[PDB]
């Protein structure tokens with residue numbers, strides 16, 4: 001079965017949309033894995049758009065269910081020493097941050113499974129520290145967070161010297177599918193909770209970028225990379241080294257790297273040779289994590305409000321395009 005999982009997640013009405021007495025036009029059916037939009041400016045009951053995906057998560061879907069479906073199979077591959085990428089795609093205010101970062105529950109117990117509102121990124125770190133420690137495998141975990149705007153790279157974690165300088169990138173001679181981003185701040189994570197500091201720094205930096213770059217907030221991609229270094233011995237000296245990399249990507253709604261990414265995924269899905277990784281910064285950076293038949297995931301976040309009709313249709317079309325799944329009968 002395809003190693004490229006494409007899922008749609010529709011959030012619930014917030015409260016503001018409630019004040020604007022927003023109403024629903026999106027029809028979620030997680031059993032048939034279909035999401036339908038009911039069009040009609042002057043009220044239409046003779047044409048509704050339906051899409052099918054690998055998974056459809058309605059408003060009541062809890063974080064752990066999204067995580068268990070999308071991330072678990074993938075983290076499995078990363079722990080085996082492979083490179084994988086999980087994308088979050090959708091316009092602002094649809095649910096990427098909630099899905100990718102979520103809400104913290106400090107002062108509480110845990111188990112990567114019990115955290116009620118933790119997002120993919122924190123929960124991933126949470127499962128990593130729990131899984132590898134229970135297994136008794138020696139490991140280290142470092143992370144980076146870069147931004148892509150107007151096909152230029154920006155380090156969102158570098159402490160000093162960080163008010164506008166670009167990161168440079170060039171292929172590196174010993175992994176033709178990889179590239180080297182010199183100067184890219186890589187922060188080592190000693191315990192799961194340390195990720196919150198990182199995300200805040202990233203967020204602050206992102207807040208500044210917006211005051212310098214027009215529509216940054218809606219035209220930037222972020223790649224949050226977590227590298228896992230593992231090693232197990234055998235009281236004989238036999239060492240097994242595994243280095244895994246998981247890219248958590250936040251894609252800006254289609255309201256360049258986005259164009260090339262859809263052609264690459266489509267190409268991987270259709271098995272067309274010559275996947276155009278080189279035609280954008282994002283696809284060059286992730287090339288080595290969209291390698292063999294590695295596992296890939298794309299979460300499309302949408303709003304259930306009629307007011308976002310066009311945006312939802314936009315997001316859905318893109319997800320549908322990346323991996324075309326034929327609608328079932330009836």
Ligand SMILES: Nc1ncnc2c1ncn2[C@@H]1O[C@H](COP(=O)(O)OP(=O)(O)O)[C@@H](O)[C@H]1O
Nearest residue numbers: 011012014090091092093094095096097098099
């Ligand atoms: N599925 C959800 N369940 C409860 N609240 C959600 C859910 N998804 C998003 N939200 C809420 O929406 C807002 C966050 O949206 P956000 O994730 O930032 O969207 P985007 O990723 O487009 O920026 C907060 O109110 C957050 O609590």
